[PDB]
Amino acid sequence: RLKSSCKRHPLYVDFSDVGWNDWIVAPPGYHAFYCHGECPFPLADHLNSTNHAIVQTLVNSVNSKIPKACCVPTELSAISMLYLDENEKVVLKNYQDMVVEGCGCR
Amino acid sequence: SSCKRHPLYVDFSDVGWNDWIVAPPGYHAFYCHGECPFPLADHLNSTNHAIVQTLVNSVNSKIPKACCVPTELSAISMLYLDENEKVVLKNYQDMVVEGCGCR
Ligand SMILES: *[C@@H]1O[C@H](CO)[C@@H](O[C@@H]2O[C@H](CO)[C@@H](O[C@@H]3O[C@H](CO)[C@@H](O)[C@H](O[C@H]4O[C@H](CO)[C@@H](O)[C@H](O)[C@@H]4O[C@H]4O[C@H](CO)[C@@H](O)[C@H](O)[C@@H]4O)[C@@H]3O)[C@H](O)[C@H]2NC(C)=O)[C@H](O)[C@H]1NC(C)=O
Numbered sequence: 001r002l003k004s005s006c007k008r009h010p011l012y013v014d015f016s017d018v019g020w021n022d023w024i025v026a027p028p029g030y031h032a033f034y035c036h037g038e039c040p041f042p043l044a045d046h047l048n049s050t051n052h053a054i055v056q057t058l059v060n061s062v063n064s065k066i067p068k069a070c071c072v073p074t075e076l077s078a079i080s081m082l083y084l085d086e087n088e089k090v091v092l093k094n095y096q097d098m099v100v101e102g103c104g105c106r
Numbered sequence: 107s108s109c110k111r112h113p114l115y116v117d118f119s120d121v122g123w124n125d126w127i128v129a130p131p132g133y134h135a136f137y138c139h140g141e142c143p144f145p146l147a148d149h150l151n152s153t154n155h156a157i158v159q160t161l162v163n164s165v166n167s168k169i170p171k172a173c174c175v176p177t178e179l180s181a182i183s184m185l186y187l188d189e190n191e192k193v194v195l196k197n198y199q200d201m202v203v204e205g206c207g208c209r
């Protein structure tokens with residue numbers, strides 16, 4: 001469980017495991033990766049952070065009760081999925097912000 | 107109970123930025139705090155990814171829940187003292203939280 005800095009980790013999400021395959025016709029699953037890692041003090045530019053996150057991580061080093069910045073998706077991409085409308089017609093809809101492209105500390 | 111914006115006044119003398127920052131003496135930075143419940147309900151400024159992570163978390167604990175982080179940020183202007191001892195007016199983007207959400 002060793003501490004590491006904020007980055008992107010792989011995650012394949014199979015819809016049958018989540019019970020979504022009842023409504024989603026395709027795909028069976030997708031590579032939706034996830035963000036995880038520590039956002040150290042002082043936080044870097046290269047960690048895709050905001051001035052607020054630099055300030056909050058600083059406030060934490062003085063008051064531990066205030067959390068540091070979370071490692072979160074900063075850049076997301078879309079995926080197309082198929083579903084069945086009311087009259088059994090197949091529909092193709094683009095789902096915004098489904099895949100993590102880059103992580104960052106916020 | 108859930109993800110919301112909470113007030114956080116940031117005083118520079120308490121933070122140690124007193125030396126380089128001339129004005130203001132601090133500012134109302136605000137901070138995000140709260141639960142990202144399962145299943146993710148409306149009005150929480152979430153992404154579809156956050157809904158997906160949240161649901162995978164309920165089936166696999168190794169995968170964390172979505173974090174409550176700032177989703178909208180505004181700027182503040184500051185007066186700072188540079189290397190040459192001249193007091194400079196600068197704009198600092200993304201300093202104040204305007205809205206929180208589950209990401
Ligand atoms: C800070 O944020 C930045 C910005 O987000 C992060 O840097 C970005 O990093 C990602 C890669 O991790 C990158 O996105 C790629 O762009 C390339 C452009 O040429 C593509 O080659 C690449 O496509 C593959 O991956 C995508 C999913 O990530 C898929 O949509 C696609 O099908 C491609 O897949 C290949 O590899 C996979 C392996 O999983 C395989 O399954 C595929 O079939 C195929 O072999 C990405 O779209 C950006 O280019 C980066 N931008 C910059 C400016 O560097 C940065 O790392 C963040 N910091 C932290 C700490 O996370």
Ligand SMILES: *[C@@H]1O[C@H](CO)[C@@H](O[C@@H]2O[C@H](CO)[C@@H](O[C@@H]3O[C@H](CO)[C@@H](O)[C@H](O[C@H]4O[C@H](CO)[C@@H](O)[C@H](O)[C@@H]4O[C@H]4O[C@H](CO)[C@@H](O)[C@H](O)[C@@H]4O)[C@@H]3O)[C@H](O)[C@H]2NC(C)=O)[C@H](O)[C@H]1NC(C)=O
Nearest residue numbers: 109110111149150151177178179180202203204205206207
């Ligand atoms: C989901 O995200 C949305 C989008 O971010 C969030 O909705 C926004 O919420 C904000 C914050 O309340 C709100 O922004 C205000 O707009 C007001 C007009 O409607 C302005 O009055 C206000 O400006 C004041 O506060 C700022 C900081 O927020 C200051 O920098 C500024 O100087 C202003 O100061 C006034 O009020 C303060 C009290 O804090 C006082 O000291 C001063 O004397 C002065 O009276 C904000 O900019 C947006 O209007 C919302 N947008 C929409 C579309 O609804 C939403 O809350 C999120 N959900 C969660 C859970 O976070």
